[PDB]
Amino acid sequence: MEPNPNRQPVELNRTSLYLGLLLILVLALLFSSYFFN
Amino acid sequence: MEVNQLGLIATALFVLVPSVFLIILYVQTESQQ
Amino acid sequence: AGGERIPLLFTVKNLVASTQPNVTSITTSTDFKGEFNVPSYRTANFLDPKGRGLASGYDSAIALPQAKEEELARANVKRFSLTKGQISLNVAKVDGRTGEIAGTFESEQLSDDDMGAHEPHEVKIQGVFYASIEPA
Amino acid sequence: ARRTWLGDILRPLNSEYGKVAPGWGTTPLMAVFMGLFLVFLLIILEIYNSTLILDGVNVSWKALG
Amino acid sequence: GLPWYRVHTVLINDPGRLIAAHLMHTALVAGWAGSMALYELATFDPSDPVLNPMWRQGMFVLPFMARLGVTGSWSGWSITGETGIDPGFWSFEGVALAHIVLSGLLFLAACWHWVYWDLELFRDPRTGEPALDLPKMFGIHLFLAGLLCFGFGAFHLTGLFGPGMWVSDPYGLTGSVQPVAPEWGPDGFNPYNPGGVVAHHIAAGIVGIIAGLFHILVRPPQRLYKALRMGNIETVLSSSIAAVFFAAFVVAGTMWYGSATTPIELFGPTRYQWDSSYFQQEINRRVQASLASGATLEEAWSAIPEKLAFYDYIGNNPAKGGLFRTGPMNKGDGIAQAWKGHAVFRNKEGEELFVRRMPAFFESFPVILTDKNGVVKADIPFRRAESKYSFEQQGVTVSFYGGELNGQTFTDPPTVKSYARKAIFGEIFEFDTETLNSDGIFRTSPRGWFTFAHAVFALLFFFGHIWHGARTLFRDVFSGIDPELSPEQVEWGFYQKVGDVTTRR
Amino acid sequence: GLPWYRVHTVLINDPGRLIAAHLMHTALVAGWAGSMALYELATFDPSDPVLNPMWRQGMFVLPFMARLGVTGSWSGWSITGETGIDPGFWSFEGVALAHIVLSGLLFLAACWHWVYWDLELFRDPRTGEPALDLPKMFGIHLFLAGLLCFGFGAFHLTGLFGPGMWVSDPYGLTGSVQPVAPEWGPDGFNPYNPGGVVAHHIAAGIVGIIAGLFHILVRPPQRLYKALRMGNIETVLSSSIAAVFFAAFVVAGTMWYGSATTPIELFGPTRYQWDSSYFQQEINRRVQASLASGATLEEAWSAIPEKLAFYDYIGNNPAKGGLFRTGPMNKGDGIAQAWKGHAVFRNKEGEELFVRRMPAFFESFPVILTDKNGVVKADIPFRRAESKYSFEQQGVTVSFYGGELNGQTFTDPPTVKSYARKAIFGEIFEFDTETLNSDGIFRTSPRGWFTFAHAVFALLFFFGHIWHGARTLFRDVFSGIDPELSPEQVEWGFYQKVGDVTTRR
Amino acid sequence: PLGISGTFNFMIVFQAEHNILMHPFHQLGVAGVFGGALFCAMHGSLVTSSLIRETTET
Amino acid sequence: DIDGIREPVSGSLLYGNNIITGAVVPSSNAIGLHFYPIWEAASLDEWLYNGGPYQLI
Ligand code: CLA
Ligand code: CLA
Ligand code: CLA
Ligand code: CLA
Ligand code: CLA
Ligand code: CLA
Ligand code: CLA
Ligand code: CLA
Ligand SMILES: CC1=C(/C=C/C(C)=C/C=C/C(C)=C/C=C/C=C(C)/C=C/C=C(C)/C=C/C2=C(C)CCCC2(C)C)C(C)(C)CCC1
Ligand SMILES: CC1=C(/C=C/C(C)=C/C=C/C(C)=C/C=C/C=C(C)/C=C/C=C(C)/C=C/C2=C(C)CCCC2(C)C)C(C)(C)CCC1
Ligand SMILES: CCCCCCCCCCCCCCCCCC(=O)O
């Protein structure tokens, strides 16, 4: 049985890394006050 | 202050889990090219 | 239900049980009612899991050297209860030949209080009894 | 592809990919059932809303007796 | 490579790994169910279903097991308070265990389908390409849905072969699992009639069988096949999401308004029962009745079951919570211990006075005592200097009938005010705040939490519907519009009919 | 590629990025010291240098600032108890700020050297290869180390231009920062003579300056250059680790045993002061003197300072802790509030009895009272059935002198028994257990934690020395032995000298 | 017992009732496992030490 | 003391504020529109109580 032809590489460029890390850290900054309550 | 004690673990995982996810994806992108 | 285990010293120690007055014979309507002592479920040498006891053992919580003792006094100070129970014996079968009787019983007593550590429960016990009477 | 016993049994159930009835087919009949179902949801909604009030239908907890 | 937000599209043309993924999802959801129940069993206190029911304890899945007949524990308790029962294997624990075993079995099947993805069943016999005859699959699955739906109603809910479901009186005092017979009349559409739930599943089950049979034998019209791209699995995702968010809005509403399937002994009262004084009406009804037949005040109120009094108290109103006030309601006002009794206030002239009750909108509310006509006769003033109506000036006293303070009267103004500040919440209870280290602030119930999550998820799945619907109908331009789109096609007047090149002028 | 445990070897032939790596490590460390100090200020209670000194509060870096002359905060308190004091910039807060700023400048330096790694300075003019002249660098760095060592002793420690260092009396009552003269005599080598610390730095600094000069001017002989592989930077790593773990064992030693650099007012008592009853002896001397001058028992014991009694208590013995008993000592026995007084026990015959003290080995210890001869006279028995020495049988009383209980006598056996159980710990103190929610179990002091960490670290660094020492001397075969190694070199009898082919037959 | 602390309990009670430490079969067991650990490290170290160069340093 | 009424408002994290509630608090009403640099205060202690940093920032 052949290997699966539907597989694909996945990518995240550096700029998307910086964008996503900013998103997560600012979201944590906003909700943390509410988690500690 | 008398804050909810699980707030710390909530906040730590809230940061760590999705950040690690992004870092995993970025580094394996770089070792491709 | 829920998983709570209730130990008890099921006992008739020092039983004194009496019939109604003017009993010319024991019949299948004869009732005895009496009371017994219920000593502590553990006796004085029993050591608890941290080595504390009444007649032996540590007299304090040695694992917490500088804790305030006042919070622990009820656990540190073992106490020996003695309480009373009540029992009914209802004769429902008599072999007037042999002097054998048989019937049911109900008793009420208290359960283990763990040498004063917690409050006992009320227990009601039911069952059957047999006795043989001999001229003394 | 790999054949299996269960595969061969189920086979005809996944064998008519693409088959259509011609033209509009049962579309008019579907439209009727859609219409009936709209009216029926309307009633159900307006009963819950107390905009449709019906005899012996008391929309309150007191309909548990 | 693929962007991160598209990793799962590798399954679009791979029915076997699509099944593998769906199995893993189903494994995870069932696993959750089993984990959630175990955590709840380990934290649930079954010892008082009157003043510490499951819905005060932050219980979420326990009420859904109870709703359909699972009411006891292997440990010997039942949620109805009966003790020494033997549930058999279908205890809370056994239900939890089955979902975990099911989870493990789904996990293994997922592995098998992921490795052996290339099954001939998934190939179109004419072209050798993977293909799923989605119209016929719909008919098969719909036929199955209808069998299950019908059986659920015909056997489980009736008690014919099954336990029935939770039913209760209108005041949630005596609920239990009973078989329910169908209501075939128009009151079967009454959301508060449990017989309608039975009839629905029977009739709808039969319609589903018939519709299923139709959709297995009758092919889709070509017009419709073309319109809805019935060769594209994503059209099914688009319509499926739409049905899912429809269902989600419905279950949120019936949870919030109440219906036969959201009984208050499993989920708590609704806010509307506070708005309309639903339990307070009933309580007064009984005191009047006790009085008419000559009982004393102490007697009339002592006859009031605590369970009913506890519903007439705003701390159980699901609209008194907050988003980040977490945990069980007990964590806020405490673990209710006893009804203190019904507080009656009187001024120095013997007139009875009535505390104005807090409306759900208000975090805080002033203490205002009115007479039976609604005229203000006492309050607790803010500015003291021009106070007309103070408890001190008006001689207000509080007397208790029934409950733990029955037959007690208080006259010292600070004590009387203290009870008047609680009377705005409805009936007055004694709470244990030490055990949970309760902070004193009202939390919402499971009815509230469930409604919030499901209303929110619904709205979000509407966006999913719009996104995947768009993707289906505009598949051809996903990656961009035609680089040879000619300007005559988008400029006005060239074609009579917009976009149709055969209508040139 | 590279194994995970070798990633950092990319720096071996890259002096610029090595410097960058080292700058970054340096920034991390200064950053830590500033962070650590701020956390300790945010949590330090300065209000009681007697019964709540720093070493009771888990302060770790606070004493190293105190040790060298930083003693005050910008908020106007000092650790010597003096209020209303202007420390200038070099307060605890200013020192922390400085390390944070320094950390940030080193961070930027590291980015610069990382980016501009290819500097011509790091390349050998002869061959154009990256080269570091390590003999010359050593001389340079030794000379600088000597200058700093000398100046630190000549100016900071003497007070010529600088504050001096923590000095105290032999019982840790009156410590403070004072200039210290050098002790040039043989007592300079006495670890308890502070003047030796000064003299050490002056002379050692001078020696370093000369040695550094020799090492800048005189090339190493070919013999040693080959034997020690001085063209290979890993040789420096190997010898450096060795000097490091050597140094780490010494500071662990001097911290455990005590020295002029590890004062008890900053780090707590040593265990050996408990073992020899060092403080108990002195307290007794003072008492025996007062009674000589004709004061009463109350008067003689009331003259003992709280500070001195607090040292005669096993809760401050650093050898009484546990590895996972975490936090400050106040978290164990609580926050010391007052001396209760010296407890004197007597039997019914009026003879005075002495509680035998707990040795540090013992987690728990029986209560045994002996007379002045050490004959057992009273105890708390385990088995009571055949006790002869119970307090009830012997009429044991307790009377207090000094402290909060001065002049009180307790006669009921339960009370006498609780004070006898505390008398095994030494002097009895009133503690606050509520504030920190203390659990009653002894912790160790910063003296113990410092000693543990450095002795562990020293031992591991030994393995680092062996590792990099072997990699230096065996670099040629680090990847494996020579694939064409003849048996004649490794088998017996061929060569007259092992591993020398010239000695064949 | 099937536990970590229960194992130690079993070990301690054993020593008290049998002086297992003074029993030569246990002494042979300690030689067995000490020596087995020794020869384990010895063999590993000796083979590792004489690996033929087949790779580079990276 | 933002409002000059000797009623200090706590604004910083270490004095019991979180991210949402924290603030650098405006300078005292007793100062009005007067310039209040550091060197116009008897001490940093005074400057801090009266809202000095708001003006600087
Ligand atoms: C004798 C036959 C019989 C009987 C007695 C019933 C009885 C019942 N049916 Mg069933 N039914 C039957 C046959 C029968 N059915 C058949 C043959 C079918 C066809 C297969 C169905 C299909 C069916 C459906 C699809 C539904 C019912 C529902 C119900 C219940 C109505 C009460 C209720 O709470 O509605 C409450 C529900 C409504 C009032 C519908 C509201 C519709 C919303 C408002 C539409 C708009 C949503 C929109 C996307 C949101 C927009 C934004 C919004 C936030 C503002 C009741 C148990 C309803 C139900 O399950 O309720 C839980 C329901 O939704 N029935
Ligand atoms: C439908 C889902 C659902 C519902 C309604 C409940 C409801 C409840 N649970 Mg349950 N639970 C669930 C799922 C659910 N649970 C799941 C999936 C888990 C596993 C994690 C649990 C685990 C669990 C435990 C362990 C406990 C509960 C408990 C409770 C009770 C209190 C809940 C609470 O305080 O929430 C408060 C909730 C919040 C404050 C959540 C807010 C959501 C955040 C802010 C959203 C983040 C925003 C996001 C980043 C958006 C930005 C995106 C944008 C940038 C693009 C209540 C009955 C508790 C209880 O009382 O049990 C006895 C309890 O201890 N639950
Ligand atoms: C049954 C529901 C369902 C299913 C099967 C899919 C399936 C798909 N979506 Mg759709 N979608 C849905 C609901 C659904 N969606 C809903 C409700 C929304 C609105 C929120 C969307 C919005 C949406 C967008 C905007 C896009 C898709 C895309 C896709 C495709 C790629 C997804 C992917 O790789 O994600 C990868 C995602 C991750 C790796 C991580 C996401 C993590 C999120 C932020 C939080 C985690 C949630 C948590 C783990 C568990 C869920 C909790 C609760 C829902 C139960 C795939 C066919 C993509 C597409 O079209 O590509 C062609 C795309 O761009 N979806
Ligand atoms: C008049 C001049 C003068 C004076 C008064 C001093 C005074 C002092 N010197 Mg300095 N010294 C001087 C000149 C002077 N020095 C000069 C000119 C040099 C040459 C540059 C040095 C080099 C020097 C060194 C290298 C050391 C001192 C140390 C000391 C202190 C000794 C007291 C002590 O605590 O030792 C305690 C130290 C020891 C007793 C030596 C430890 C030896 C151990 C046993 C080595 C073996 C450890 C081994 C690796 C592992 C252990 C195995 C196992 C137990 C774990 C004291 C402050 C010592 C010090 O600073 O200690 C704090 C020290 O280590 N001196
Ligand atoms: C720039 C100057 C400077 C100054 C004045 C200070 C000052 C201080 N630091 Mg900071 N520090 C600095 C740079 C500086 N630091 C840098 C660059 C770093 C990062 C590496 C740190 C990291 C740091 C930490 C991690 C800590 C301090 C601490 C302290 C305080 C106590 C210092 C102490 O006990 O040293 C004691 C130092 C020694 C005992 C070193 C002795 C040298 C040994 C013996 C090596 C000898 C080998 C030598 C080559 C051979 C010489 C031969 C001889 C013949 C000449 C003090 C306020 C402590 C504190 O309280 O912080 C809050 C603390 O814990 N500092
Ligand atoms: C911190 C002080 C220090 C250090 C690190 C060095 C380092 C060095 N010296 Mg310099 N030197 C110094 C001070 C120092 N020197 C001083 C004060 C003088 C007097 C002016 C000199 C005079 C001098 C000369 C004259 C020469 C050097 C040389 C050298 C180099 C080679 C050393 C060698 O072959 O060691 C060999 C030693 C070893 C390989 C390892 C020894 C390990 C010991 C023995 C272990 C002991 C363990 C034991 C258990 C612990 C003790 C127990 C306790 C009871 C005592 C090296 C760079 C040589 C060189 O190349 O010059 C350029 C050289 O020719 N030095
Ligand atoms: C030289 C190192 C050192 C030392 C001696 C101290 C000492 C102290 N600290 Mg400081 N601390 C340090 C470094 C150090 N700290 C660092 C680097 C940080 C930053 C994280 C801190 C942060 C810090 C805080 C935040 C606090 C302290 C506090 C304290 C005090 C109590 C510590 C305690 O309860 O320990 C508990 C220690 C342990 C439980 C030891 C854990 C070791 C385990 C066994 C891990 C190792 C296992 C390993 C994975 C095995 C794998 C092997 C593998 C190869 C097979 C004490 C005076 C406390 C205090 O009182 O503050 C005022 C406090 O609150 N410290
Ligand atoms: C001054 C100290 C020092 C320095 C500069 C080095 C430098 C180096 N070591 Mg040596 N080493 C040291 C101390 C040191 N070591 C000590 C003390 C030990 C004994 C434990 C060793 C044992 C050792 C071995 C066994 C090996 C090296 C190797 C190496 C090289 C590669 C390191 C690497 O890629 O790690 C990469 C490491 C990681 C990605 C993560 C490691 C995580 C560790 C286990 C825990 C993290 C600790 C944490 C950050 C806090 C540190 C606290 C600190 C105070 C101790 C590099 C030249 C390797 C080599 O020879 O390459 C050819 C190798 O095989 N080292
Ligand atoms: C294999 C096997 C087995 C086993 C199994 C198991 C053991 C299972 C488990 C399972 C489980 C145990 C599972 C669980 C799961 C869980 C989950 C899946 C969860 C989820 C979650 C989430 C998703 C969440 C989310 C969130 C958050 C976090 C926040 C808030 C909001 C929300 C809700 C969104 C058996 C033996 C049976 C059999 C054989 C085989
Ligand atoms: C840039 C800049 C700046 C800034 C800076 C900063 C802000 C920094 C900071 C920094 C810091 C803030 C740092 C920190 C660090 C820390 C550390 C480095 C830590 C460490 C840790 C560790 C390593 C640990 C370990 C361990 C554990 C965890 C457990 C137990 C055991 C042990 C101890 C081992 C400034 C403005 C100034 C200037 C300009 C520029
Ligand atoms: C600010 C009020 C007090 C006066 C400050 C005195 C002047 C600054 C002293 C700073 C002490 C650091 C000197 C030791 C640093 C050694 C030199 C170095 O290695 O970089």
PDB file of C-alpha atoms and ligand atoms in Angstrom, chain B residues 21, chain E residues 4-9 12 234 237 241 457 460-461 463-465 467-468 471 478, ligand 3:
ATOM      1  CA  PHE B  21       2.736  25.871  19.035  1.00  0.00           C
TER       2      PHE B  21
ATOM      3  CA  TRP E   4      -1.338  26.950   9.745  1.00  0.00           C
ATOM      4  CA  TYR E   5      -5.074  27.673   9.390  1.00  0.00           C
ATOM      5  CA  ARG E   6      -5.385  25.082   6.576  1.00  0.00           C
ATOM      6  CA  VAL E   7      -3.520  22.050   7.918  1.00  0.00           C
ATOM      7  CA  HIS E   8      -6.772  19.999   8.088  1.00  0.00           C
ATOM      8  CA  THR E   9      -7.669  20.405   4.415  1.00  0.00           C
ATOM      9  CA  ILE E  12     -10.823  16.779   1.912  1.00  0.00           C
ATOM     10  CA  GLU E 234     -17.826  21.227   1.884  1.00  0.00           C
ATOM     11  CA  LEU E 237     -20.192  21.106   6.163  1.00  0.00           C
ATOM     12  CA  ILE E 241     -22.995  23.922  10.577  1.00  0.00           C
ATOM     13  CA  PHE E 457     -21.085  28.949  20.283  1.00  0.00           C
ATOM     14  CA  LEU E 460     -19.842  31.744  16.273  1.00  0.00           C
ATOM     15  CA  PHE E 461     -21.018  28.758  14.200  1.00  0.00           C
ATOM     16  CA  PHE E 463     -19.787  32.568  10.978  1.00  0.00           C
ATOM     17  CA  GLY E 464     -18.554  29.076  10.222  1.00  0.00           C
ATOM     18  CA  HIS E 465     -21.696  28.575   8.154  1.00  0.00           C
ATOM     19  CA  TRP E 467     -17.397  30.917   5.672  1.00  0.00           C
ATOM     20  CA  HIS E 468     -17.807  27.359   4.489  1.00  0.00           C
ATOM     21  CA  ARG E 471     -16.105  28.562   0.077  1.00  0.00           C
ATOM     22  CA  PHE E 478     -10.771  30.871  -3.835  1.00  0.00           C
TER      23      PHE E 478
HETATM   24  C1  CLA I   3     -17.867  20.885  12.352  1.00  0.00           C
HETATM   25  C2  CLA I   3     -17.284  22.074  12.320  1.00  0.00           C
HETATM   26  C3  CLA I   3     -16.184  22.453  11.477  1.00  0.00           C
HETATM   27  C4  CLA I   3     -15.313  21.717  10.701  1.00  0.00           C
HETATM   28  C5  CLA I   3     -15.170  20.279  10.491  1.00  0.00           C
HETATM   29  C6  CLA I   3     -14.425  22.687  10.048  1.00  0.00           C
HETATM   30  C7  CLA I   3     -13.395  22.347   9.141  1.00  0.00           C
HETATM   31  C8  CLA I   3     -12.520  23.216   8.522  1.00  0.00           C
HETATM   32  N1  CLA I   3     -12.465  24.586   8.633  1.00  0.00           N
HETATM   33 MG1  CLA I   3     -14.045  25.660   9.531  1.00  0.00          MG
HETATM   34  N2  CLA I   3     -15.069  26.785  10.877  1.00  0.00           N
HETATM   35  C9  CLA I   3     -16.007  26.306  11.760  1.00  0.00           C
HETATM   36  C10 CLA I   3     -16.380  24.932  11.943  1.00  0.00           C
HETATM   37  C11 CLA I   3     -15.835  23.867  11.307  1.00  0.00           C
HETATM   38  N3  CLA I   3     -14.760  23.928  10.432  1.00  0.00           N
HETATM   39  C12 CLA I   3     -16.522  27.388  12.576  1.00  0.00           C
HETATM   40  C13 CLA I   3     -17.508  27.279  13.671  1.00  0.00           C
HETATM   41  C14 CLA I   3     -15.865  28.539  12.152  1.00  0.00           C
HETATM   42  C15 CLA I   3     -16.001  29.899  12.691  1.00  0.00           C
HETATM   43  C16 CLA I   3     -15.131  30.024  13.927  1.00  0.00           C
HETATM   44  C17 CLA I   3     -14.954  28.161  11.100  1.00  0.00           C
HETATM   45  C18 CLA I   3     -14.098  29.073  10.475  1.00  0.00           C
HETATM   46  C19 CLA I   3     -13.116  28.701   9.595  1.00  0.00           C
HETATM   47  C20 CLA I   3     -12.146  29.551   8.899  1.00  0.00           C
HETATM   48  C21 CLA I   3     -12.038  30.984   9.011  1.00  0.00           C
HETATM   49  C22 CLA I   3     -11.378  28.716   8.124  1.00  0.00           C
HETATM   50  C23 CLA I   3     -11.879  27.360   8.389  1.00  0.00           C
HETATM   51  C24 CLA I   3     -11.109  26.365   7.703  1.00  0.00           C
HETATM   52  C25 CLA I   3     -11.418  25.037   7.840  1.00  0.00           C
HETATM   53  C26 CLA I   3     -10.645  23.891   7.200  1.00  0.00           C
HETATM   54  C27 CLA I   3      -9.226  23.878   7.765  1.00  0.00           C
HETATM   55  C28 CLA I   3      -9.243  23.966   9.283  1.00  0.00           C
HETATM   56  C29 CLA I   3      -7.901  23.845   9.892  1.00  0.00           C
HETATM   57  O1  CLA I   3      -6.914  23.310   9.413  1.00  0.00           O
HETATM   58  O2  CLA I   3      -7.852  24.384  11.156  1.00  0.00           O
HETATM   59  C30 CLA I   3      -6.550  24.487  11.781  1.00  0.00           C
HETATM   60  C31 CLA I   3      -6.740  25.141  13.097  1.00  0.00           C
HETATM   61  C32 CLA I   3      -5.826  25.036  14.052  1.00  0.00           C
HETATM   62  C33 CLA I   3      -4.613  24.279  13.769  1.00  0.00           C
HETATM   63  C34 CLA I   3      -5.902  25.645  15.418  1.00  0.00           C
HETATM   64  C35 CLA I   3      -7.119  26.484  15.704  1.00  0.00           C
HETATM   65  C36 CLA I   3      -7.189  26.687  17.195  1.00  0.00           C
HETATM   66  C37 CLA I   3      -8.409  27.454  17.689  1.00  0.00           C
HETATM   67  C38 CLA I   3      -8.115  28.914  17.673  1.00  0.00           C
HETATM   68  C39 CLA I   3      -8.792  27.196  19.144  1.00  0.00           C
HETATM   69  C40 CLA I   3      -8.894  25.737  19.550  1.00  0.00           C
HETATM   70  C41 CLA I   3     -10.278  25.207  19.836  1.00  0.00           C
HETATM   71  C42 CLA I   3     -10.252  24.001  20.788  1.00  0.00           C
HETATM   72  C43 CLA I   3      -8.987  23.177  20.646  1.00  0.00           C
HETATM   73  C44 CLA I   3     -11.348  22.949  20.621  1.00  0.00           C
HETATM   74  C45 CLA I   3     -12.675  23.414  20.065  1.00  0.00           C
HETATM   75  C46 CLA I   3     -13.540  23.872  21.183  1.00  0.00           C
HETATM   76  C47 CLA I   3     -15.000  23.825  20.797  1.00  0.00           C
HETATM   77  C48 CLA I   3     -15.254  24.286  19.386  1.00  0.00           C
HETATM   78  C49 CLA I   3     -15.496  22.432  20.865  1.00  0.00           C
HETATM   79  C50 CLA I   3     -11.486  22.647   7.543  1.00  0.00           C
HETATM   80  C51 CLA I   3     -12.164  22.027   6.346  1.00  0.00           C
HETATM   81  C52 CLA I   3     -10.067  27.094   6.886  1.00  0.00           C
HETATM   82  C53 CLA I   3     -10.273  26.994   5.413  1.00  0.00           C
HETATM   83  O3  CLA I   3     -11.270  27.291   4.794  1.00  0.00           O
HETATM   84  O4  CLA I   3      -9.236  26.562   4.684  1.00  0.00           O
HETATM   85  C54 CLA I   3      -9.569  26.201   3.350  1.00  0.00           C
HETATM   86  C55 CLA I   3     -10.240  28.615   7.226  1.00  0.00           C
HETATM   87  O5  CLA I   3      -9.517  29.501   6.769  1.00  0.00           O
HETATM   88  N4  CLA I   3     -12.903  27.353   9.238  1.00  0.00           N
END
